[PDB]
Design an enzyme around this catalytic site. Structure first.
Site, PDB file in Angstrom:
ATOM      1  N   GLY A 100       0.790  -1.210   0.000  1.00 16.84           N
ATOM      2  CA  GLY A 100       0.000   0.000   0.000  1.00 16.84           C
ATOM      3  C   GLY A 100       0.827   1.268   0.000  1.00 16.84           C
ATOM      4  O   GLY A 100       1.907   1.329   0.589  1.00 16.84           O
ATOM      5  N   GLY A 129       1.088   5.412   0.923  1.00 19.78           N
ATOM      6  CA  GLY A 129       0.601   6.336   1.925  1.00 19.78           C
ATOM      7  C   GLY A 129       0.870   7.775   1.521  1.00 19.78           C
ATOM      8  O   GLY A 129       1.357   8.055   0.422  1.00 19.78           O
ATOM      9  N   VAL A 138       4.634   1.064   1.953  1.00 18.00           N
ATOM     10  CA  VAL A 138       4.720  -0.108   2.816  1.00 18.00           C
ATOM     11  C   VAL A 138       4.871  -1.357   1.961  1.00 18.00           C
ATOM     12  O   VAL A 138       4.149  -1.527   0.979  1.00 18.00           O
ATOM     13  CB  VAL A 138       3.475  -0.217   3.704  1.00 18.00           C
ATOM     14  CG1 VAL A 138       3.636  -1.325   4.691  1.00 18.00           C
ATOM     15  CG2 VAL A 138       3.213   1.098   4.393  1.00 18.00           C
ATOM     16  N   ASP A 175      -4.542   9.526  15.223  1.00 17.86           N
ATOM     17  CA  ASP A 175      -4.974   9.119  13.884  1.00 17.86           C
ATOM     18  C   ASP A 175      -5.680   7.766  13.960  1.00 17.86           C
ATOM     19  O   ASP A 175      -5.392   6.846  13.195  1.00 17.86           O
ATOM     20  CB  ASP A 175      -3.794   9.084  12.907  1.00 17.86           C
ATOM     21  CG  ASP A 175      -4.232   9.030  11.427  1.00 17.86           C
ATOM     22  OD1 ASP A 175      -5.363   9.493  11.102  1.00 17.86           O
ATOM     23  OD2 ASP A 175      -3.442   8.528  10.577  1.00 17.86           O
TER      24      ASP A 175
HETATM   25  C1  LIG Z   1      -1.121  -1.442   4.575  1.00  7.93           C
HETATM   26  N1  LIG Z   1      -0.459  -2.588   5.233  1.00  7.93           N
HETATM   27  C2  LIG Z   1       0.284  -2.564   6.480  1.00  7.93           C
HETATM   28  N2  LIG Z   1       0.653  -1.336   6.962  1.00  7.93           N
HETATM   29  C3  LIG Z   1       1.393  -1.253   8.204  1.00  7.93           C
HETATM   30  C4  LIG Z   1       1.758   0.067   8.689  1.00  7.93           C
HETATM   31  C5  LIG Z   1       2.476   0.198   9.875  1.00  7.93           C
HETATM   32  C6  LIG Z   1       2.851   1.589  10.447  1.00  7.93           C
HETATM   33  O1  LIG Z   1       2.858   2.617   9.712  1.00  7.93           O
HETATM   34  O2  LIG Z   1       3.055   1.627  11.697  1.00  7.93           O
HETATM   35  C7  LIG Z   1       2.819  -0.952  10.594  1.00  7.93           C
HETATM   36  C8  LIG Z   1       2.486  -2.241  10.165  1.00  7.93           C
HETATM   37  C9  LIG Z   1       1.757  -2.390   8.939  1.00  7.93           C
HETATM   38  C10 LIG Z   1       1.357  -3.707   8.409  1.00  7.93           C
HETATM   39  C11 LIG Z   1       1.701  -4.906   9.116  1.00  7.93           C
HETATM   40  N3  LIG Z   1       1.361  -6.122   8.657  1.00  7.93           N
HETATM   41  C12 LIG Z   1       0.665  -6.218   7.501  1.00  7.93           C
HETATM   42  C13 LIG Z   1       0.276  -5.094   6.733  1.00  7.93           C
HETATM   43  C14 LIG Z   1       0.637  -3.796   7.211  1.00  7.93           C
END
Ligand SMILES: CNc1nc2cc(C(=O)O)ccc2c2cnccc12
Length: 330
Positions: A44, A46, A51, A154
């Site tokens: 994804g 942001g 990420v 958030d």
């Molecule tokens: C959109 N997908 C994910 N975004 C994350 C964003 C953060 C953060 O910004 O703290 C931390 C962990 C994850 C994550 C962990 N496991 C699977 C998927 C994700």
């Protein structure tokens, strides 16, 4: 000038700590080599990050690498500090490593992986008990980090990773979390528009832990009414109108008076006069299995203009909405 405000729980947690706990601008970060992780696929994009699922070469474990989009270096240290500060807290995400790609020298955070089901298909399928359970788990994360002097700032569905097979949950994206210090005036351009508390929509800068409690109400109302999102405003100014059309304008205006808040001249027209609706207007055929006199009472006690009359995370967890999930956790 605006009347001051002090959080009514954990007001002084931070004052009572070694300076290095909250003085993150002097935090000295030890950057690792990001080659220790090979990126697998993009999970994804942001606004402040990108990420990736990635593999730790050493052990072969699934990991997640969040490459940080370029912001004031102290904001990175803020997020890193808050994560090392919260490590091992109930339902907080775990920072596994901090690294820098050797070629680009651009910083990135490595988190634990969570086999998550996105809320786009999830929230449409949860029983009434599931909404109580996961909400309780969010409250565990919020009361912990509040007790630790940190507001998350958030809280929104994209930031709650849910694993429904093992019934786990983790609260993520700490990049907008701040330390709470009584008397600090904070930036009000935080959070996402549908989960912005009224304090941010009128520019009341001395806000506190309770902002996270409005965001949780927005989520709760969004789930029990099968309305995503519940306050669907066109911008920040109209967002307040969508709130006001439900909570009423008498109340909002006493909130403005109680804090000697200066309203924008823009608001002086588009807000109007509006009554306070009974929550029953929002329950219909296809969403009443999720509504109860309990949920309504809990929901009513989160969505308050006056940030001081919101429940605390601790108060929320003793609400009768949660009596069964408290019991089945024994
Ligand atoms: C959109 N997908 C994910 N975004 C994350 C964003 C953060 C953060 O910004 O703290 C931390 C962990 C994850 C994550 C962990 N496991 C699977 C998927 C994700």
């Amino acid at each position: 000038g605006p009347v001051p405000s002090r959080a009514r729980v954990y007001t002084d947690v931070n004052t009572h700590r070694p300076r290095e706990y909250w003085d993150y601008e002097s935090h000295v970060v030890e950057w690792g080599n990001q080659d220790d992780y090979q990126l697998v696929r993009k999970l994804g994009r942001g606004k402040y990050s990108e990420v990736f699922e990635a593999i730790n070469i050493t052990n072969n474990e699934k990991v997640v690498v969040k490459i940080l989009k370029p912001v004031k270096k102290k904001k990175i240290k803020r997020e890193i500090k808050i994560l090392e500060n919260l490590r091992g807290g109930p339902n907080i995400i775990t920072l596994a490593d901090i690294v820098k790609d050797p070629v680009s020298r651009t910083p990135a955070l490595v988190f634990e992986h969570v086999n998550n089901t996105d809320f786009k298909q999830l929230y449409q399928t949860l029983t009434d008990y599931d909404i109580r359970f996961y909400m309780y788990e969010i409250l565990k994360a919020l009361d912990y980090c509040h007790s630790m002097g940190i507001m998350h700032r958030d809280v929104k569905p994209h930031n709650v990773m849910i694993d429904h097979e093992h019934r786990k949950l983790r609260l993520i994206d700490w990049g907008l979390a701040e330390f709470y210090h009584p008397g600090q005036e904070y930036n009000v351009r935080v959070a996402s528009r549908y989960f912005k508390g009224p304090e941010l929509l009128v520019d009341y800068q001395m806000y506190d832990y309770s902002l996270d409690m409005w965001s949780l109400g927005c989520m709760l109302a969004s789930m029990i009414f099968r309305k995503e999102p519940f306050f669907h405003g066109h911008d920040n100014y109209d967002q307040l109108v969508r709130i006001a059309k439900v909570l009423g304008t008498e109340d909002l205006y006493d909130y403005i008076d109680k804090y000697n808040i200066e309203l924008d001249p823009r608001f002086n027209d588009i807000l109007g006069r509006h009554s306070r609706k009974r929550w029953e207007r929002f329950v219909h055929s296809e969403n009443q299995h999720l509504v109860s006199p309990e949920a309504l009472d809990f929901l009513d006690k989160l969505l308050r203009y006056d940030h001081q009359s919101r429940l605390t995370a601790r108060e929320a967890m003793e609400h009768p909405y949660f009596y069964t999930v408290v019991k089945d956790q024994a």
